[PDB]
Every structure is written in C-alpha cells, then in structure tokens.
Write a protein that binds this ligand. Structure first.
Ligand code: A1H9Q
Ligand code: A1H9Q
Ligand code: MYR
Ligand code: MYR
Lengths: 251, 59, 283, 178, 283, 251, 59
C-alpha cells in the first residue's frame, strides 16, 4: 500500500498510516552548498544529526469558528534544541526543512485544510502607513491567528483572512508548494522545502525564509459526539543545515 | 562574425535574417526573444512518487 | 564559416490531439485526488471520443522574455529653466520600480528577477503662461546624471558636482531622437528581490520590507545653461525595458489597489463581484 | 589630539588590569574615519562596491628588552560588539608574541552573505568589528621607558576587487581655480 | 582569413581559496618584519581553516585604461554675440588640466602619463534679459580654432587670423550633435609630467613647478557671423577623455583642497576626523 | 630556528617566538573513536571547527608569595562557547586537549614554573573523614590556590602545597606529562593530551578527566623595576571532540 | 580587415563582436579597454633577496 509513509531524521521517526503522497518543494531536494557557489571563505560547521531532527511545534485547537493560523520560519525554531544554539552563535545559516502537519478525526467529521509554504511572505500593517514591531507576526513557536473581519488595531498586521495578509486572493495560494488535509481521505500532510533565497547564505534572525499557513476552506462540522475540538500539531525537521561566522552569542 | 538564423513565420507561408554585434559588452546585445523551451512539471507534478494517470491515485 | 555562422532554433507547437474510440475498462483517468498537491494531467482524449487534430499553435508570446520585454514608464517629473526656488530647477529621483502601478504589478508576479536593462528618456518643454510671452530662445540642452550610492549630490543647478569625471552622463538636444542606453545586472546579490520579509537590524528592528534592499542610486536632470527671460517648464519621462530576463518562484497577482510606494499596505477587498444567485447564467 | 602625529601611535603601559582593551574599531574601510583616508580607503572611495579579504599588520615599537603578548580578534557582524576579552576570543583571533620578529599579521577573512558590499556601508551590509586586548601584559626591566607605542598597517589581499566607478566626495570647489 | 581575423583575449579572475586544515609546525607565516619594506603576502588560508572557494570576480574595471577613460569637464566660459567690449565677444584659453578639481585629482595620482586624447565640445546659447526681446534670428554657427604655441593670435572677433590656412578648426551649427575629434600624444618629452620639481633658469631662478612645462597652445572660439540686434550669450564646455593610457610612479592622493591653478600651494589639514575615544565603536 | 611554533585550530591561531618543544601526551596523538571499540549504537555528532578551537581561560597574577594553582577539566570549559552547549545537551563526550600556558618576563627576572597534567587527580579533604561539596575544587574557569600551611577549614580540600593535595611528594609529579617554564629560556609551554579513561566515553559533568597544575618551584624575584607582578594565562583547545546521547539540556 | 573578438559576459550566461578601422591614424581607434594583465611585485616585493613567506624574515 502507498498510504503508509515513514520518515527517519536523526534520532526521531515519524509514521503515518493514512496519508497522501509527499510534495518536494519545486522538484528539488535539499543539498549542501557547492564549492563553486560559496562566497564565505572559512570552514563551515555541519552538526548533522544534532540539528537535523524532528521538533514538535506546540499544538492548537480546531474549532467550528476557526479561521486560520500562520508560523514564520526559522524564527519558530529560534529556541529549540541545538538548532537554536547554532542560530544564536553563528552569523550565517542555510538549511532546508521537512514540514509534517498532523490532524486526525473520525469518519463522521468533515472539513478541509490548506497547508502551504509561502517564501518571502511580506505582510502589510493594519493601518496604511504607520509601522509595527517584530512581535505582531513572530514571537517564537506560538501561532498567530487570522481574522474574519478587517483588522483595526494599528499595532498588528492586517489579518483579514480572504486577503491572506498579502493583498492577494486567498484562493490563488495553490501556486506555492502545498497540500490539502481532507478528513475523508487523509490525516497528514508532508512538504519538503529546499533552501530558497537570492544569496547563498543569510542571517537566520534578521530574515524570515518562508511562512507556513493553515487555512480551513471548509469549516469543521460534526453532530452528537463528545469530541468538541480537533487538535492540530506541526512538526518540522531541518535538513542539510550548515553555519558560518562564529561570534559571541545572541543575535 | 555574422549570425544567420530563421525569422518567425508570417502571412504567405527568404525567412532568414542577419545579425552583427557592434559593442564590446554583452549587455548591449538585442533581446533574445526566440527561445521557446518550457517544462511545467516543477509546478504541476511536485510529488515524490510518480503518479500514473490511468491508475487510481490513493492506492 | 568565419564570415557567416548559421544558428538553429526550432518551433515547438502545442501537443496534438489523438484519435480516441469507445472504451470500457477498469482504468479511471478522470478520477484523481487533489489532496496530493498534484494537478491532473487528463486530456479530452481520456474522457470522450476525439478526432485527430494537428495543432500549429505555439506559445511564443507567453515567454517571460516577451512578457516583460516592453518599455514601461517608471517616473515623470517637471523642472523649470528659471525660478526663485532653487530646488524647483532640477530633479533628484532615488531609483526604484514601485512608483508606477502597471509595471510594478507586472514585476511582482515573480519573487526574484535577473536581467539587463535598457533605459530611454523622453523630454518635452512648454512655455509657461503669463502676461508677456514674446521672446526668442535657441534650442535647449539637457543633462542626465547618474550618481551611484555614496557619491556627491548637487545642491543647486550650477553646482560643481555637475562636472562629472567618473559619473556617467548624457547631454541631449531638443528635436533629436530620445536618449537611450544599456545597463548590466548591477545587484550585489545573485538576483533582484521584489519582496524581502525581514528587518535591517540584527535584533529585528528598524526598516522592514523591500525598502531595505533599495540602494541603486539617484538620477539628476537639469538644463545645461538655458535660462530664458520668461519661465519654461520641461518634463522628463523614464522608461525601463528588461532584457535577457530570468525569473524564479512565481506568486499570485495582487488583488488590492496599491497605496504606498515603499510598503505592501492595503485595504481589504472582496474576492470578486456578485451575481443574483448560484444558478443565474443570463446577462 | 593637539599634535596630529599622535594619531598614528597606540599607547601601551607596563601596569594594567589583567584584561584590558587596547583599541577597538569598526571594519568599514571606505566609510570609517580610521580607514577613510588611508591608501586603501582613498582607492575604495572612487568605487561603489568592494569584496575580498584584508590584512592588518601590527608592529611593536618599544624597547628591545620589553616583552608582552596581545590578543587581536575579528568579530563578524552582530547585534552587540564584544565588551570583554572573553567575548572577543569567541571570534577569529590570533595570539601575538613579541620577540625578534616585530610584526604580526591579522588576516580578516571575507565572511559575507552577498558577493559584494557597498562602500557607503549601511546596516544591511555591516562587516563587523576589530578589537585588541592584553593577553599577558607588558613587562620591562629597570632602566627602560614605562610606555610604548604600536602602529597599524592596512592593505588588501590578492582576492580583493572593486566595481562601479563613481566620483569621490572628498574633493570639491566653489569657484573656478585661477 | 584576410576578411576576418580572430583576436583572442582572456578572463583573468582573482585567486581562488584553497582548503586548509589544522596545523602545528615551526613555520610562522603570520610573523614578519615590515622594516624590510616588504608587504606581507599571507592569505587567510595561512592562519585559519578555510574551505575551497572558486572565485570568478575579475579586476576588469580597476585598470588605468578604464579608470581614466571617462569624459570630464576641463573648462567653461561665456562669450556674447554683440557687445561694446571687444574682449568679451570671444574666448582665449591656454590649454591645461589644472582648472577643474575632480579630473585634476584623478590625473595627479600618477607622476607621468602617456595617452591619446578625445576632445568633445558642448555649446549652448540663451537670450539675455532686457526690456525688449522680440526678434527673429536664424540658427547660429560657431568656430573653434586651435593655435599651437608661437602662432598668431586674434585680437578681435573679425580679425584676419580667423582665416586659418594651417591651424585646425571646426565649424559647428546649433541643433546638431556635439563636435568631437582625436588628438595624438603631442609632448616633446617621452611622457606628460603632472609634477616638475625644478626651475626654468639654469641658476635655479624664475618660474617653479609644473608651470614651466605647459606649452600646449591655445583655443579660441567665436560666433562666425552672428550679430543679433539684441545680445545673446553662449557657453562652451570642453571635455577630455584619455585613450590608450599608460602611467608610471603612482603617488598618494591629495588630502588638502586646491587653491591655485598653477601651484601646489595649500593650507594644512587634519589627517582625519575624530571620535570620542580609542574604544568607541558605536555610531 | 626551532624556537618558533605556530598552532592553528579552527578559526584561532597561537604564535610563540621563544618556546621549547611540544610534549605529546604519552606519545599518542588525539584521534576519533574506532568502530571496533565503540559501545553506544546511535550516530555521534562531530561539530569539528565549532568546538575544536582555542579558548582563553581568564588570567591570574604571579606574585613573590604565590604558591600555586590548579584547574579541573573539562569543568573549566563547562560554560565556554558551543563546547559548553554540547556538554549540556549530550549524555556522553570524548575529546583530547591542547594546553598552552603563557608567561613572559624580562631578562632581569628569575623564576621557574612546573606545568603538569594529572589524570584522575583525586583529592582529600582538609579534615580526615567528613565531606566537601563540588565547589571546593571546581567552580568554572576560576583558579584555585594552594596553601603553604596546612589547611584547617573542613569545607575545603587539603591545600598543603608540598603534598599536592594527593598525599604524594610534590617533587615526583615529573612522571606525568609536563613541561617547565624557566624565565631565562622560554615563555610558554605546550602539552597535547589524548583522551585517557577506562571506558570509551564518559559524562563530562560527572567526571573530571584530568587536572592542570602550575607550581612555582623557584619563587619569582626582581629588583628595581616598575613591574610588580607577572601575569599568567592559560589557553585550551579541544581536539577530535564527539558527543552522543541527546537529551534535554542541563546536566 | 575585420577583427572578431569576444565581448564581456553579461546576464544570462553569440558573445562575439566585429570591429573595423576607418581612419588612417592609430590615434583615431577606440579605447583598448580589454587588457587585464597586472603584476604588483614592483610595489609589494621591491626587496633584493627573495623572502619566503613560511620562513622567518630576519634570520
Ligand atoms: C544609471 O542608469 C540606470 C540606473 C539605474 C537603473 C534602474 N535599475 C534597476 C531598477 C530596478 C531593479 C529591480 N530591483 C528590484 C528590487 N528593488 C529592491 C530594487 C530594484 C533593478 C535595476 C536604470 C538605469
Ligand atoms: C587642439 O586640440 C587639442 C589641443 C590640446 C588639448 C590638450 N592636450 C593635453 C592636455 C593636457 C595634457 C597633460 N599635460 C600634463 C603636464 N602639464 C604640464 C601639461 C598637460 C596633455 C595633453 C586637447 C585637444
Ligand atoms: C564596429 C563594427 C562595424 C561593422 C560594420 C558592418 C560590417 C562591415 C563588414 C561586412 C560584414 C563582415 C563582418 C565579418 O567579417 O565578420
Ligand atoms: C573607409 C572604409 C569603409 C568601409 C565600409 C564598411 C565595410 C564594407 C566592406 C565589408 C567588410 C569587408 C572589409 C574587408 O574586406 O576587410
């Protein structure tokens, strides 16, 4: 059967028994930087198994009135194991990712989720002009919620769901690497993202490589059951990570 | 130093044109608007395992 | 050869349609699963009887090279030959592509771009209205100066900075063909970035967005020595034309109207227009 | 500095706390006042982009009987420059031993996210800091001066290059010369 | 060949970086002695572990040919078509490169130079203000005359000397492209000298400095026959562009501002700007 | 000349212009663990340049009345760069060390120091019986001082110098890997220590692999000079370090 | 009488251009801005005895 998948990174394993295929970025698998594309001269460090492993990114509740959530990477892993330490101590970084989203429900539930990775998901403020701090869209592994109505608070991002916070039609996000979680058929989604940027390496604190979004297109529904909510969990594993430019910590 | 290549078809169908470069910088050349290769698999078929159209998808 | 080398390209043409007959089998091309992120590759031949058709249509005009290979206005401004305000006798524009909506939207369909540039300048002049207009003035001449970042900037129409020894410049006389030039790929990175989801300072503070990566320089314009007894106003228009283009990571076209030249800020907009009901099909 | 020539010499003293800073500076060869007017900064100021590694050479001009050790470190860009030697030693550094050879070379490697950097450096293209600290301290015998000086030399390596000519902002005139 | 000969140049590229591992030996590449006048040739590979890097950067734009191969203004002056003062209706400039600061400093980075020259003239005209400006005047024409040293010099706009039989000249009509020409290496010595530490007389007396070696001639300009009822002022700008350049004996760039066109005189200037203390590293 | 030495580890370099030879442990150079001697099964992590680099261990003053000092490893590096982080996050560790001691003085000073690395330097308490906490002999990179007179405080180790705190003659420490710093001749000392233990790997927090001791056999002396003390500095660089058994941090 | 030579690289990388001289004086030719040879030893290593980087300088 092709509905079973198993993934082994480092000292951690993921098993799914009811799942769809695996989506691989833009057809490219993660890989190390070549000698003819590098620019930095000093030797890189490659922790390997110490950093390339699955980390569980806390959990959220799917209610009948949920609208959606987003996470920004690699900020979401900024304080997670030795990956966070290497991020703190190094000037430059580079790594691909494997994203696994778990959501399971009985055969009597219904609903559909869109899982999509958006590279360079620049967002606009709630009030045209003005400005917002780096806390309205990234504060660690905590998830940020979209809003059904137009946002009004000037201190946070425009969370109107139907625009995806980017001024574009929410229905066109299918162009990015994506997958669907339809409760009739599957309970997980797997995406492999290569490193995408305009430069060989970049500082992992200053720049958000990509944004993960989970959006319920068909809202959850059920009847006459004791289960009131459907938890959603996100797991991420860096791949082929390497760092450069050791200095004092913090960033 | 002269390139000879075919020109796009037109109504009523020596379908050849001549080109010479005069400047020392490649940025000065004219647009290369005659390449027509394309491959949509990167966006239409990004899955890992190959899927056969005639077979059922999930199992 | 030596004198004549022969190149060889090729027409591509879209896929033909193959003849299909009645079928009755266990294969189900029509049934699929979108949950995999896979777009179905079925063709009409797989769901109905079809005749053999030989297509000669080609996708020549849809290439990114042709799509982006059109000159588009990016900036216009006015400057006067003589006036009391010093700042109003010359222009000073920080180069960017976000000023004009149409070309901005054309560009922002991709995340990263790499191309050479062809710049064309269109300059026109007109006499300002007044109570006395009778004068005789010879043909005017204009100077366009490009100052890479960090260079000296002129503060007045007759400053010393206009004596460019290393900054490129063009002197153009009215009545001739518009000025033009070519520019190579002048980015420090491996590609231009239309979007930048990041900050300037390492502690996530300061400027945010693509404003951080715009360091292309300035353009200055003036009348060389024309100073008429009566004011004359000139307008300059700048046109950009990408060449040898390459693009990566397409993204959906924008839906909301633009409101700032250096920000993504917007106002929420409906997905689309409405109709009477889900069955209405008439006009 | 009431005397201009005093700018070129870095003071050093016999008795100092166990860990102490000799000097600190920003690595902006075309913009920093330290490197602005050197033989390298003047060349850079005619261009807009630069890349490659750099050499800093330090020479001890004390007495022949004086001795000491110094730690010279390069700290890549970050949110905070080093405040103590403990911080400085985490980056690229060399321990310099003063002896018959009067000079030591700190080679600043090219560590950057982009192939090129702007001469008019901004926060996006920061390059880091360079600092020098006492490693052991300066010791002298009887009958020698209690203070000494060091000098620094700056030059480019064989992989250095520049790009995008421009006019230098250091020279200007208000009227035609006569 | 005969019709087509093929030349062959080559990209150079900067040196690559070689992989280096841990070391423990008696060799000390880092330790040297500047007293020898020798600049150390160490590379990062000699003091830390490095990866293999293949550089494709080239030093093409740093060559002296490209550095000095930009047109720069060297002189501008004004002359009127009609006026009471005879001396104000034409220009007379003794050729030299010390008038304009930027190109002067670019040149004085070398002691001796040898190159061909490309000269371009930009001419513009404007009507002078007055109580009555209504007139009709056809297009103007200008003459540029070059007089090698010792030749006759015109004393008025309609002198006989303007009938050049051997002095080269250019006649230019307004509205066309700027005039241009090429000049070979016209020095009596084997190279131009920017600096001359010596005297004119054999007993160390007379003129001192580079003023002694400036014998390049003069340039004269006039309106051919234009003489309008109302005054009109024209301005000429001269641009120089070295070609086929060779340079010897580099010298440090100047620090002090220029004050004389034919002397090195200066006012003492501080070495550089100051900061709070030797440890200050913040903005 | 053989009086010049240069050592390059990671992104750090040490240069000495007046020095003696280099002492290599028991004739063995540090190396990685072989496949036929390992016992742990999971893949090790080898940070390489991120951890194998020179760290400067604070500084001390040599006075006319100094008696000696000691440091315990790897506790001395427990909070130093990424070496400390890898120590915290892993159950097992293994690494050799390069120890460099700097001490320079003019030609008119005199004195002699013994630099020795003592494996398994178990120490006895000041009062027979009783017990002491793990603060009387190791509190980070701070140096602990020997005493000329017999120790009396029951809360600390017996610091009598002439017994070296181990119940043995101080003059016999020459049996261990050692070197001398004699101010007439040299100003540094270099020792390379391989990993020595009875098991392939061990926890780096629970067990002190070896102890570094610096002892003035000939006390410092000088006359008519403005230099009142001679600083001593210690630099250490782990070699061929590898770790195993990732878990929650702290230890 | 026509020279054919390569032109500098550019984005997207017939990289050939043709040149003909029209005037009888060599001073009329265009700039030769494609020579890239260089040798810094005249200014960086003006010493008489060769110095080996790995060896100590003075003795
Ligand atoms: C001097 O003659 C010139 C100078 C500049 C230009 C404009 N060149 C140009 C303009 C725009 C982009 C696209 N970049 C996208 C990312 N954004 C942050 C910056 C602009 C690239 C080149 C033309 C002629
Ligand atoms: C007639 O068409 C001409 C005539 C003259 C020129 C200027 N030619 C020229 C100018 C300057 C130097 C450099 N020399 C340096 C030493 N200094 C004492 C004299 C100037 C060389 C040639 C152009 C066109
Ligand atoms: C700067 C180059 C000017 C070229 C002028 C047009 C071509 C004249 C020569 C005829 C074509 C032959 C070219 C060749 O031999 O490759
Ligand atoms: C004054 C020379 C004018 C040359 C005009 C352009 C060249 C025309 C001939 C075509 C190129 C062949 C030249 C050659 O035979 O070397």
């Amino acid at each position: 059967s092709d509905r079973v998948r198993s993934i082994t990174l480092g000292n951690s394993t993921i098993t799914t028994q009811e799942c769809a295929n695996v989506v691989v970025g833009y057809g490219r698998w993660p890989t190390y930087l070549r000698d003819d594309e590098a620019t930095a001269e000093d030797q890189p460090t490659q922790p390997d198994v110490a950093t390339c492993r699955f980390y569980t990114l806390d959990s959220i509740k799917w209610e009948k009135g949920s609208v959606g959530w987003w996470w920004k990477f690699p900020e979401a892993l900024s304080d997670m194991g030795l990956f966070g330490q290497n991020m703190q101590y190094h000037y430059l970084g580079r790594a691909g990712y494997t994203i696994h989203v778990q959501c399971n429900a009985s055969k009597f539930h219904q609903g559909c989720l869109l899982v999509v990775c958006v590279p360079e998901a620049e967002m606009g403020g709630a009030v045209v002009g003005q400005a917002f701090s780096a806390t309205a869209m990234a504060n660690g592994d905590k998830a940020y919620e979209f809003t059904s109505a137009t946002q009004s608070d000037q201190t946070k991002v425009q969370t109107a769901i139907h625009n995806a916070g980017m001024g574009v039609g929410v229905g066109n996000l299918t162009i990015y690497p994506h997958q669907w979680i339809n409760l009739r058929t599957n309970n997980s989604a797997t995406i492999v993202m290569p490193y995408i940027n305009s430069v060989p390496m970049d500082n992992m604190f200053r720049h958000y490589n990509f944004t993960l979004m989970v959006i319920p297109f068909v809202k959850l529904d059920y009847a006459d059951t004791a289960s009131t909510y459907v938890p959603i969990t996100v797991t991420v594993a860096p791949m082929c990570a390497e760092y450069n430019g050791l200095r004092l910590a913090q960033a | 130093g002269a390139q000879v290549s075919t020109q796009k078809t037109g109504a009523h169908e020596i379908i050849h044109y001549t080109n010479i470069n005069y400047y020392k910088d490649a940025a000065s050349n004219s647009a290369n608007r005659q390449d027509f290769t394309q491959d949509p698999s990167k966006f239409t078929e990004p899955v890992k395992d190959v899927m056969i159209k005639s077979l059922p998808a999930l199992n | 050869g030596d004198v004549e080398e022969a190149i060889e390209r090729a027409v591509v043409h879209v896929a033909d349609t193959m003849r299909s007959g009645p079928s009755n089998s266990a294969s189900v091309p029509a049934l699929t699963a979108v949950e995999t992120g896979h777009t179905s590759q079925v063709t009409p031949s797989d769901t109905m009887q079809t005749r053999h058709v030989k297509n000669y249509h080609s996708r020549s005009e849809s290439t990114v090279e042709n799509f982006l290979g059109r000159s588009a206005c990016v900036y216009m401004e006015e400057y006067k030959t003589t006036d009391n305000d010093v700042n109003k006798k010359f222009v000073a524009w920080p180069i960017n592509t976000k000023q004009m909506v149409q070309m901005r939207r054309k560009l922002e369909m991709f995340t990263y771009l790499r191309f050479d540039m062809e710049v064309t300048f269109v300059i026109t002049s007109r006499q300002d209205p007044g109570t006395t207009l009778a004068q005789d003035m010879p043909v005017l001449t204009h100077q366009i100066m490009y100052v890479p970042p960090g260079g000296p900037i002129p503060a007045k129409v007759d400053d010393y900075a206009w004596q460019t020894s290393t900054n490129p410049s063009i002197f153009w006389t009215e009545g001739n063909a518009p000025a033009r030039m070519s520019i190579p790929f002048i980015s420090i990175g491996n590609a231009y970035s239309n979007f930048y989801d990041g900050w300037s300072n390492f502690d996530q503070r300061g400027s945010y967005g693509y404003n951080t990566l715009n360091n292309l320089g300035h353009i200055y314009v003036r009348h060389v020595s024309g100073s008429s007894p009566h004011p004359i106003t000139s307008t300059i228009r700048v046109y950009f034309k990408p060449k040898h283009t390459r693009a990566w990571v397409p993204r959906p076209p924008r839906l909301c109207q633009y409101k700032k030249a250096f920000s993504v800020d917007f106002t929420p907009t409906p997905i689309t227009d409405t109709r009477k009901d889900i069955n209405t099909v008439t006009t | 500095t009431t005397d201009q020539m005093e700018m070129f010499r870095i003071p050093v003293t016999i008795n100092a706390p166990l860990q102490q800073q000799v000097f600190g500076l920003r690595l902006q060869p075309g913009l920093d006042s330290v490197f602005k007017h050197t033989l390298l900064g003047e060349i850079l100021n005619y261009y807009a982009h630069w890349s490659g590694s750099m050499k800093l050479t330090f020479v001890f001009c004390g007495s022949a009987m004086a001795t000491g050790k110094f730690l010279i470190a390069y700290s890549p860009p970050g949110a905070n420059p080093p405040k103590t030697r403990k911080d400085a030693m985490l980056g690229t550094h060399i321990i310099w031993d003063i002896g018959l050879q009067s000079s030591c070379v700190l080679c600043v490697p090219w560590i950057s996210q982009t192939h090129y950097r702007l001469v008019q450096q901004d926060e996006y293209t920061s390059a880091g800091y360079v600092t020098c600290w006492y490693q052991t301290g300066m010791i002298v015998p009887p009958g020698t001066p209690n203070s000494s000086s060091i000098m620094c030399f700056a030059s480019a390596c064989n992989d250095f290059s520049v790009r995008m000519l421009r006019d230098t902002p250091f020279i200007s005139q208000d009227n035609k010369l006569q």
